[PDB]
Write an enzyme that holds these catalytic residues in place. Structure first.
Site, PDB file in Angstrom:
ATOM      1  N   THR A   1       0.851  -1.222   0.000  1.00 22.21           N
ATOM      2  CA  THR A   1       0.000   0.000   0.000  1.00 22.21           C
ATOM      3  C   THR A   1       0.869   1.249   0.000  1.00 22.21           C
ATOM      4  OG1 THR A   1      -1.724   1.239   1.193  1.00 22.21           O
ATOM      5  CG2 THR A   1      -0.160  -0.020   2.517  1.00 22.21           C
TER       6      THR A   1
ATOM      7  N   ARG B   1      -5.236  -0.736  -4.120  1.00 22.81           N
ATOM      8  CA  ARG B   1      -5.007  -2.174  -4.171  1.00 22.81           C
ATOM      9  C   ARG B   1      -5.006  -2.751  -2.764  1.00 22.81           C
ATOM     10  NH1 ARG B   1      -0.234  -4.589  -7.577  1.00 22.81           N
ATOM     11  NH2 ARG B   1      -2.123  -4.803  -8.853  1.00 22.81           N
TER      12      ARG B   1
ATOM     13  N   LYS C   1      -8.782   3.969   0.114  1.00 21.44           N
ATOM     14  CA  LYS C   1      -7.977   4.110   1.315  1.00 21.44           C
ATOM     15  C   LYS C   1      -8.056   5.494   1.940  1.00 21.44           C
ATOM     16  CE  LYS C   1      -4.809   0.690  -0.520  1.00 21.44           C
ATOM     17  NZ  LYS C   1      -3.443   0.416  -1.032  1.00 21.44           N
TER      18      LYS C   1
ATOM     19  N   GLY D   1      -1.742  -0.997   7.124  1.00 18.94           N
ATOM     20  CA  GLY D   1      -1.711  -2.009   8.160  1.00 18.94           C
ATOM     21  C   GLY D   1      -2.901  -2.943   8.094  1.00 18.94           C
TER      22      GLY D   1
ATOM     23  N   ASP E   1       6.638  -0.455  -6.001  1.00 20.77           N
ATOM     24  CA  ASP E   1       6.275  -1.347  -4.908  1.00 20.77           C
ATOM     25  C   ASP E   1       5.305  -2.403  -5.420  1.00 20.77           C
ATOM     26  OD1 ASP E   1       5.444  -2.683  -2.686  1.00 20.77           O
ATOM     27  OD2 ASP E   1       4.572  -0.949  -1.674  1.00 20.77           O
TER      28      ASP E   1
END
Lengths: 213, 232, 225, 229, 206, 235, 229, 233, 211
Positions: free
Chosen positions: I1, I19, I33, I47, I166
């Site tokens: 994330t 995602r 998010k 988290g 990432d």
């Protein structure tokens, strides 16, 4: 130590509830009118008291508002409790609490004080207006804890006369403005003496908006 | 035994509330709060609630936080208890929320606590009335007043005498000049209400202002200057 | 019918039970604290015990202390006063635990007043029948004397008498200023006031001669006065 | 209230309870060097009852017996508490509790309604608790006031005054166990309002030779009856 | 490894005015012994709300009982059916109330949001209530990777009830045939605003 | 002290009577009349309720249980909520619907505990609980404030309950269809009000039946009651 | 009368009537006397006898090696207080390795007294205790129901104690310089003024320097009574 | 009255609340219990409004557990609550003792419960008296009667409720120790009918044996009521 | 994330990818998010998803309750204080790394909250697996005074760096611009088959029920 101060009279009445009803009847008038596309709650109130600090009409949640007739302190307590219960429902279910369910929960909390020991009943009557997916609702909660479903009602001084006025001028299929005009006429039966809230989120009319009506 | 407990009577009144209000009135202590544009002032008598006594120690004005102050009039034990409850509520609000409570929130919380007393029949009413003054986040003064009944209201000017304040305010209708004018207003209001000439050492005046938010009490020399300015 | 509970206000706003407590305190033994130039002098006159000839001489004492630098005396019930004094000592202990310094006098007085007043709020507790005196004397700040009433009211004096005949002890004490008099000169004065002795009077001070700490008055000092 | 004093310095509730113990059937307790004997009248209220279901002389322990007057539900509660406590003592200490200790335990329970340190009222019961400990035989009387008095011979019940007078008159320290039985039976006969006979009286003894509760039966009563004058 | 004790998989999909929820029918023990083949993992809350619970069988039953209790209470007190979104939020909060000692269940909620307009509603959860609302399909259970492959490769948007049935049944069967501890029959439920079609597929019993 | 203000709600009167329970019974007797009866088709409950008022006598407790109320409405709401809780808890614990008698016993225990424990007042409400279960078929129960309850084939509560009972006994029969039972319910509602014709804007009427093996409750609207009223009227 | 109904009500006269009634419960106990010299304290009390067949009621109790008590008033409350003090002394000797300070124990007992006077649900202890001990010096204390306690040179309370008071007031100046026997006989003569004293109806104990608390045995009591008469 | 004492001693020594609970018992319906060699018969009075009240719903002849049965006179809701507590204790005895609860143990339990309520703050005494019939550990049958005060006693034949004195006096003159099941039932019926109006709808008679408790079919009750009519002319 | 936030002139810009991953598998392709706390306060989280989501709902509803009671615009300081107290009450567990932005009486305030209950006032921050790449972009290009448009461009570039460097980050780029007056939540700010024959799948039984 904890014992009921509200007890059945020899005739089966609960005289403390009757006395709280007398107190509410000797309180300032408030009323609600349900129009075909909305619902409105109106109420009436020395050059020193700040007006903004003593709102009788308050917002329970985005689409729910409340007004009262009776003891201001009891109203403040019950308003905080109703806000807490609406927030609890929102946290549980992720949506705004329905008007009917909030009315039921508040009714239970009010009835608790007529039976538990060492407490007097709430000395107020509440008018709760709201809108949900199931339309507009205007509910009255008594000191006893019973809740009535209304199209329109008045809950203060001379409320017999004011109920008669509303009945003689109320029609099932009316617009908001028509209802507001009826509401103001009922209360006057000045602008500084009027507070109105309308159900968009629940809104409380500003001084100018009351004046232009 | 209908008037003994905090329960309704046949007329629907709670007579114990009226009795606590009469107890507050019995103290024969007058306090006056006046709001200005950027300042608020509270002036109280420095007499005890009805020779070797320490007159400096006698006061009806208390500091809830640095920036919020109050005047509590009533039975002295009840007054001190309410001051301590207010301070505890302020500290709790600061700890739990991370900023200073404003006078409105404090008055409303104190009235919730008063309502708990007025409803639960096992406790007695505090015969304490209060003024609270502070400066809120919008940089304007707040001056609220509460009584034993648990009723709080915001005011432009209040007394714990209404027509006197009305006439003075409609007569009135620089930051330092505003502070000075409101202080003169409060001192004149107390002098008028009491209907006798004030002594600089028997009255306590405290102020909150945007220049100096901290609720501070002004020294007796300044009060003497203000009293001298009046009648001149 | 409004004087049977401490938690009911009379029509006139009065709490009769507290007035009855006041009468009880006015009917009890005499006590006084007097702030002099170099210290404070506390004296308790136990005139109720002139009858009891079997009581161990000078055994009865209404004068206590906190931290060794605060004098605490009372007029009223021994049990209630002992309760209050135990609470004061507990507050001092908690304060020292919290902060590592002795409790300021005014904070202690406020806490004791709150403790007393908490007992005039409920219908299931008996309010305290004891007027309290808490006094201290520092070299820099001189003397500080507080009287707490049974109702929770606390007030600061330069000299206070609580108990019987207090209105005569006051007028004799007010007769002259004591802030410009040494304690030793006052001991003779307090004795003359009581007469208008060695076994019915508790004496103590906090002055310079005792390093500003509590002490009962040694006999060779009282007898010549 | 229950914890209210009188202007004379006596609790109202225990004073009223004193009138309760004056009811019920009469029992007699006699202590002699050889042991302690408790006898009791049985006021059989009807011929349809099972006479032995109503009990007078219960075993607080193997070495302790007790005769109760007053409210019998309360008496049963007290005796059950005494049994539990005596067995707890026996388990903790592995010895037979002293009679005085048992009476003290019963008394502390009896006045637990005060709440000085849970029952709601005093126990309207009076107990004659006898038994044999290391000190020998002994007999105690405990009443609602909470005070427990040791007795050489005592009586309780509706006809307490007459039985107690007779016991004072005819009691001798040196008198034998058989004389103790004869005296108990003659006192009960004089003080009872029926014809003394089998099934009409209940006798138990805790003998010093055994320190054991023993309940008599017919042909134990009849043996005493045929020797009465 | 706890989820390997019973296995199981649940799969939800949406079409045009229709929504399908399917599950496998196995109840195993110790990850390899098939003890039942009629253990349906789909539970009906109301005509517009269905839930599929996968994971520990005891936790599945406990959670179903809790959900039925809450939903019946809500509906009786309101005299109306619970909204599907409200049920999803309630299920999330129930799952999270046991964050540290959870029910080892990976539920999916399927149904219709009523607006009349019947919009398909799907959402998946983890064991602690972390929920993802998805517009095409949702998967939970041990066969999650295979099911994600199936619904990735074969999902077609806006399929009628027959097309949706064929696609979802094929996805489920193909995913199950690669899974040891899930299978032994497949149940499929296709809801349309007027009716429900319940079918048991002819599946492998391996 | 406080026992001087205490009323001792949970106490026996000299005659072995509970004064609180008797006064609650009086209050209920001053409530609006609610009637219930059993037909072969199912259970019928009827009741009689300003013109600006927008169901305050008949409530649903479970898919297979419903209740008519008499007395205080707030206490009735509290007890109805608790009864719904109890039914749902039974279903939770056993995985089967609660038999009607068991729910009645639970709610009546909650009623009686208030007359035996604590220092509170009793619930001033009485219930007519109708329901269907497999063991006992259709059941109707009467519950008073003391926690006492009884089982009936047809009963009435509230004002003029004696005249309604007389009408029910004279008319109620073992073999009635749903329509005949509904007509009898309307007739009793008429007779207890001392009116020749019932008005359909002050009537509550509902019925619980079993069909296709499923329990179904119908709460009758105003117009359906109008149809029932006209049918009752021609005869 | 409205002011004496509960223990938390003050009269308009500033009086607690329930506590005064608890104290009036102390006048109907048996007379007990305590006196001291520079080394010893002697406590002598009249045992109550309620019938011919009764055993005399215990009048004095041992609290600790150098601490004993006598009681006047309700006996069960005195028993509760006695067990409280005994556990306090024993807990002190267990936590530390020293005997309890006597003033500390008396003040804790006074706290226990005054606590019951504060709450409506409780009533004051209806018994007055005299505590005789030797803690570096012979000490006599008296507790009262109102939570007040005092320290005496000579003390007496119970029924008809005014005669004992007059005797003690007449002979107070001798007690300090009296030897053990003379002081025992003074206490006995006071107790006799209260009334015949016999081995059965009189209890007598001493405690002093290097002389733990000890009830005086029967032969010694007989000899002392012969000396008195 | 959360903890306020309800039962207190009167100036004369009486606990008036218990006499009021006795009045409650006196107001209740009559019940009778008669013991035989190895079985018992319990006949309770029933009063229902004909044609409107379901007669199966009322049960004053209760099966407590496998071997013990009960009848009560007094307040019905108090009776139901006490019966539920008694059944819970019977099953706790099974669970802890691994044996069925003997009749005497159950009678002692109900007696101690009633005493407890008579002796605790914030509770009203049970206004009910019970007759409990069952079998002891030695398999002997016994009948116990418990009163509102908490006092209990065993009986050969006992009647409780309203007009219990007359039924007691009748049973004194008629009980003949070991009696056959038919004649024992007949005695129970003719004893209970001394006070209740003669009608098969005013009685419910059940019989307890080592196997189970059986309620007598109403045809027999009709026959015996007709026989009693015959004997009354 | 990848979640990030920065303070621009009179505004706070939050950004996040879309995602969610059940480990190696992409479980959600369009997860959201950015979480609404109040009109002037927004938060984003990394988290344990359940922890983030339910802690955020708790904070939102408590803040609405406080606003109703005090009739005062919420404060980012209050939000961070409540969040820190809740996170600390659990000794580390309930892992929630949160970027909390808002505008209040004291201007635009951005906070970073650690799972253990620590907070930090910041001009710009990033959290998540792709946090280091977002930080690289922000450090390289961030400057003290930036327009709302410049802030949005920087946030988008940082989130894109996280997405494309990432493996745990991917999808769309959500951004939200919060000002003292209102907010705009650009959900899609940037966005970087077989039909089986009818009757092909065999069945064993079929049941039709009509609602």
């Amino acid at each position: 130590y904890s014992f009921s101060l509200t007890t059945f009279s020899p005739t089966g009445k609960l005289v403390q509830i009757e006395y709280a009803l007398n107190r509410v009847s000797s309180s300032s008038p408030a009323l609600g009118i349900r129009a075909k596309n909305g619902v409105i709650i109106a109420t009436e109130k020395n050059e020193l008291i700040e007006e903004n600090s003593i709102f009788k009409i308050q917002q329970i949640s985005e689409h729910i508002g409340i007004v009262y007739a009776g003891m201001p302190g009891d109203f403040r307590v019950l308003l905080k409790r109703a806000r807490k219960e609406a927030i609890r429902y929102s946290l549980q279910y992720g949506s705004e609490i329905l008007v009917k369910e909030l009315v039921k929960i508040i009714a239970s909390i009010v009835q608790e004080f007529t039976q538990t020991g060492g407490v007097r009943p709430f000395g107020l009557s509440l008018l709760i207006c709201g809108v949900d997916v199931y339309g507009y609702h205007l509910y009255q909660i008594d000191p006893s804890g019973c809740y009535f479903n209304w199209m329109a009602t008045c809950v203060g001084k001379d409320y017999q006369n004011n109920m008669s006025f509303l009945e003689k001028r109320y029609n099932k299929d009316i617009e908001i403005e028509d209802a507001i005009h009826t509401a103001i006429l009922t209360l006057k039966e000045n602008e500084k003496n009027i507070e109105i809230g309308v159900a968009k989120p629940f809104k409380i009319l500003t001084q100018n908006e009351i004046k232009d009506y | 035994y209908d008037r003994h407990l905090t329960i309704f009577s046949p007329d629907g009144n709670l007579y114990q509330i009226e009795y606590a209000i009469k107890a507050v009135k019995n103290t024969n202590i007058t306090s006056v709060g006046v709001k200005g544009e950027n300042c608020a002032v509270i002036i109280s008598q420095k007499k005890m609630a009805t020779k070797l006594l320490d007159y400096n120690n006698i006061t009806n004005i208390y500091n809830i936080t640095d920036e919020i102050g109050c005047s509590m009039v009533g039975m002295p034990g009840d007054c001190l208890s309410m001051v301590y409850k207010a301070r505890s509520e302020a500290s709790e609000f600061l700890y739990s929320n991370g900023y200073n409570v404003n006078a409105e929130t404090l008055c409303r919380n104190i009235c919730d606590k008063i309502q708990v007393y007025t409803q639960h029949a096992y406790m007695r009413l505090h015969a304490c009335s209060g003024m609270i003054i502070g400066i809120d986040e919008n940089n304007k003064p707040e001056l609220f007043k509460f009584d034993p009944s648990g009723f709080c209201a915001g005011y432009r000017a209040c007394v714990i005498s209404i027509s006197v304040l009305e006439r003075l305010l409609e007569k009135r209708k620089t930051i330092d000049e505003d502070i000075r004018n409101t202080t003169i207003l409060a001192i004149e209001a107390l002098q008028t209400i009491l209907a006798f000439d004030l002594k600089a050492s028997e009255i306590e005046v405290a102020i909150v202002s945007t220049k100096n938010r901290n609720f501070t009490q002004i020294s007796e020399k300044e009060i003497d200057n203000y009293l001298t300015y009046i009648a001149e | 019918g409004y004087d049977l509970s401490v938690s009911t206000f009379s029509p006139d706003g009065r709490l009769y039970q507290v007035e009855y407590i006041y009468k009880s305190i006015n009917n009890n033994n005499t006590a006084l604290c007097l702030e002099c130039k170099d210290g404070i002098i506390c004296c308790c006159i136990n005139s109720n015990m002139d009858k009891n000839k079997m009581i161990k001489k000078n055994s009865y004492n209404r004068i206590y202390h906190v931290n060794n630098n605060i004098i605490i005396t009372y007029s009223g019930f021994d049990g209630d006063a002992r309760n209050i004094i135990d609470r004061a000592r507990s507050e001092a202990n908690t304060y020292y635990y919290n902060f590592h310094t002795n409790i300021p006098l005014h904070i202690l007085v406020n806490r004791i007043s709150l403790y007393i007043h908490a007992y005039t709020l409920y219908w299931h507790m008996r309010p305290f029948a004891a007027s309290i005196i808490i006094s201290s004397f520092n070299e820099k700040d001189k003397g500080d004397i507080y009287c707490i009433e049974p109702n929770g009211a606390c007030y600061k004096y330069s000299g206070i008498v609580i108990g019987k005949n207090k209105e005569m002890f006051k007028t004799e004490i007010e007769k002259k200023d004591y802030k410009d008099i040494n304690v030793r000169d006052a001991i003779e004065d307090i004795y003359k006031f009581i007469l208008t002795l060695q076994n019915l009077v508790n004496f103590s001070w906090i002055c310079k001669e005792s390093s500003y700490e509590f002490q009962n008055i040694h006999e060779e000092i009282l007898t010549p006065a | 209230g229950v914890n209210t004093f009188s202007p004379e310095g006596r609790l109202f509730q225990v004073e009223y309870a004193l009138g309760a113990i004056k009811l019920g059937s009469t029992a007699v307790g006699i202590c002699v060097n050889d042991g302690v004997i408790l006898a009791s009248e049985r006021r059989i209220s009807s011929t349809l009852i099972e006479k032995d279901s109503v009990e007078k002389l219960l075993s607080i322990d193997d070495h302790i017996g007790c005769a109760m007057s007053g409210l019998m539900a309360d008496a049963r509660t007290l005796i059950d508490y005494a049994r539990v406590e005596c067995n707890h003592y026996k388990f903790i200490y592995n010895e037979n509790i002293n009679i005085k200790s048992c009476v003290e335990l019963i008394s502390e329970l009896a006045l637990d309604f005060s709440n000085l340190s849970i029952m709601s009222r005093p126990f309207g019961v009076a107990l004659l608790i006898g038994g044999v400990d290391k000190n020998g035989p002994c007999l105690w009387y405990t009443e609602p006031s909470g005070t427990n008095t040791r007795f050489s011979a005592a009586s309780i019940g509706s006809a307490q005054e007459g039985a107690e007078l007779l016991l004072q008159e005819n009691y001798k320290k040196d008198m034998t166990f058989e004389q103790a039985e004869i005296l108990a039976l003659t006192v009960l006969r004089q003080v009872m309002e029926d014809k003394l006979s089998t099934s009409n009286v209940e006798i138990c003894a805790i003998k010093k030779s055994d320190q054991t509760f023993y309940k008599y039966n017919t042909d134990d009563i009849s043996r005493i009856i045929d020797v009465l004058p | 490894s706890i989820y390997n004790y019973n296995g199981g998989c649940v799969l939800g999909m949406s079409g045009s005015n229709c929504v399908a929820i399917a599950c496998d029918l196995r109840l195993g023990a110790n990850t390899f012994t098939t003890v039942s083949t009629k253990f349906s993992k789909i539970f009906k809350m109301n005509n517009n709300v269905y839930v599929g619970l996968s994971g520990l069988a005891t936790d599945i039953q406990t959670l179903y009982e809790i959900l039925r209790y809450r939903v019946n209470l809500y509906e009786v007190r309101q005299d109306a059916e619970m909204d599907v979104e409200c049920f999803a939020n309630m299920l999330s909060s129930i799952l999270y109330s046991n964050r540290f000692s959870p029910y080892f269940v990976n539920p999916i909620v399927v149904g219709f949001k009523l607006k009349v307009n019947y919009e398909p509603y799907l959402t998946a959860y983890d064991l602690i209530g972390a929920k993802c609302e998805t517009r095409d399909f949702v998967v939970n259970g041990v066969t999650s990777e295979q099911l994600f492959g199936m619904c990735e490769s074969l999902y077609v948007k806006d399929q009628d009830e027959n097309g949706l049935f064929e696609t979802i049944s094929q996805c489920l069967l193909s995913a199950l045939d690669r899974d040891c501890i899930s299978g032994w029959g497949a149940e499929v439920l296709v809801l349309t605003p007027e009716k429900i079609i319940k079918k048991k597929l002819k599946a492998r019993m391996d | 002290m406080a026992r001087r203000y205490d009323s001792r709600t949970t106490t026996f009167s000299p005659e072995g009577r509970l004064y609180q329970v008797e006064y609650a019974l009086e209050a209920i007797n001053n409530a609006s009349i609610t009637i219930g009866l059993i037909t072969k088709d199912g259970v019928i409950l009827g009741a009689d309720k300003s013109k600006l008022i927008d169901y305050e006598k008949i409530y649903k407790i479970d898919k297979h249980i419903f209740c008519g109320v008499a007395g205080l409405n707030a206490d009735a709401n509290i007890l109805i909520n608790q009864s719904r809780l109890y039914a749902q808890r039974y279903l939770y614990n056993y995985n089967e619907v609660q038999p009607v008698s068991q729910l009645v016993v639970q709610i009546c225990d909650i009623k009686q505990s208030y007359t035996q424990y604590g220092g509170l007042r009793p619930y001033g409400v009485s219930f007519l609980i109708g329901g269907y279960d497999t063991k006992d078929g259709y059941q109707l129960y009467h519950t008073d404030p003391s926690g006492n309850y009884s089982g009936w084939f047809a009963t009435a509560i509230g004002t003029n309950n004696l005249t309604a009972s007389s009408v029910l006994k004279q008319e109620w029969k073992n073999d009635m269809t749903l329509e005949e039972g509904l007509l009898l319910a309307l007739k009793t509602l008429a007779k207890s009000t001392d009116t020749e014709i019932p008005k359909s804007e002050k009537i509550e009427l509902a019925y619980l039946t079993n069909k296709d093996g499923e329990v179904y409750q119908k709460y009758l609207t105003e117009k359906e009651i109008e149809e029932l009223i006209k049918l009752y009227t021609q005869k | 009368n409205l002011y004496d109904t509960d223990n938390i009500i003050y009269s308009p006269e500033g009086r607690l009537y329930q506590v005064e009634y608890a104290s009036e419960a102390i006048k109907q106990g048996t007379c007990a006397v305590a006196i001291k010299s520079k080394d010893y304290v002697v406590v002598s009390g009249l045992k109550k006898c309620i019938s011919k067949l009764s055993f005399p009621q215990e009048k004095i109790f041992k609290i600790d090696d150098y601490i004993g008590i006598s009681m006047s008033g309700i006996t069960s409350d005195a028993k509760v207080l006695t067990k409280f003090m005994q556990n306090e002394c024993l807990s002190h000797k267990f936590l530390y390795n020293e005997n309890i300070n006597i003033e500390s124990l008396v003040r804790s007992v006074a706290d226990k007294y005054q606590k019951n006077t504060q709450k409506s649900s409780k009533r004051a202890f209806g018994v007055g205790l005299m505590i005789a001990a030797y803690h570096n010096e012979p000490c006599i204390f008296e507790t009262r129901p109102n939570g007040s306690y005092f320290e005496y040179d000579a003390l007496s309370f119970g029924a008809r104690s005014h005669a004992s008071k007059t005797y003690l007031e007449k002979n107070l100046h001798l007690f300090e310089e009296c030897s053990l026997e003379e002081l025992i006989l003074h206490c006995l003569k006071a107790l006799k003024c209260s009334l015949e004293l016999t081995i059965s109806n009189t209890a007598l104990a001493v405690v002093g320097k290097n002389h733990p608390w000890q009830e005086i045995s029967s032969l010694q009591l007989e000899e002392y009574l012969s000396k008195v008469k | 009255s959360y903890d306020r004492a309800i039962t207190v001693f009167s100036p004369d020594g009486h606990l008036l609340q218990v006499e009021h609970a006795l009045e409650a018992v006196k107001k209740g319906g009559c019940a009778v219990a008669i013991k035989s060699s190895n079985f018992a018969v319990l006949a309770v009075e029933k009063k229902n409004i004909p044609k409107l009240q379901n007669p199966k719903t009322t049960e004053k002849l209760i099966k407590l557990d496998e071997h013990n049965c009960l009848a009560f006179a007094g307040l019905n809701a108090d009776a139901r609550v006490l019966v539920n507590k008694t059944r819970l204790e019977c099953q706790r005895y099974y669970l802890n003792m691994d044996e069925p609860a003997p009749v005497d143990y159950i009678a002692k339990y109900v007696a101690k419960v009633q005493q407890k309520f008579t002796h605790r703050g914030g509770v009203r005494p049970f206004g009910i008296a019970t007759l409990i019939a069952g079998f002891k550990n030695n398999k002997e049958i016994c009948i116990y009667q418990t009163e509102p005060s908490g006092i209990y006693a065993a009986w050969k034949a006992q009647a409780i409720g309203k007009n219990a004195k007359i039924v007691q006096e009748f049973l004194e003159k008629n009980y003949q120790e070991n009696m056959e099941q038919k004649d024992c039932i007949f005695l129970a019926l003719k004893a209970i009918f001394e006070v209740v109006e003669l009608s098969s709808k005013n009685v419910e008679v059940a019989l307890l044996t080592e196997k189970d408790l059986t309620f007598i079919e109403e045809q027999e009750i009709n026959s015996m009521v007709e026989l009693i009519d015959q004997e009354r002319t | 994330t990848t979640i990030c936030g920065l303070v621009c002139q009179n505004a706070v810009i939050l950004g996040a990818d879309t995602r969610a991953t059940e480990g190696p598998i992409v479980a959600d392709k369009n997860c959201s998010k950015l979480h609404y706390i109040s009109k002037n306060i927004w938060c984003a989280g990394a988290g344990v998803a359940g922890d983030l989501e339910h802690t955020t709902l708790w904070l939102q509803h408590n803040v609405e309750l406080h606003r109703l009671n005090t009739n005062t615009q919420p404060r980012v300081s209050m939000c961070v204080s409540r969040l820190t107290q809740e996170l600390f009450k659990y000794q580390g567990y309930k892992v929630c790394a949160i970027v909390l932005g808002g505008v209040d009486v004291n201007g635009p305030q951005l906070y970073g909250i650690h799972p253990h209950g620590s907070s930090c006032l910041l001009p710009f921050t990033a959290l998540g697996s792709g946090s280091l790449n977002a930080m690289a972009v922000l450090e390289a290009k961030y400057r003290d005074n930036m327009t709302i448009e410049e802030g949005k461009n920087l946030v988008c570039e940082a989130i894109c760096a996280g997405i494309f460097n990432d493996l745990g980050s991917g999808g769309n780029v959500d951004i939200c611009v919060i000002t003292k007056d209102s907010y705009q939540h650009i959900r899609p700010y940037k966005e970087p088959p077989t039909i089986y024959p009818k009757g092909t799948t065999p069945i064993l039984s079929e049941k039709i029920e009509y609602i």
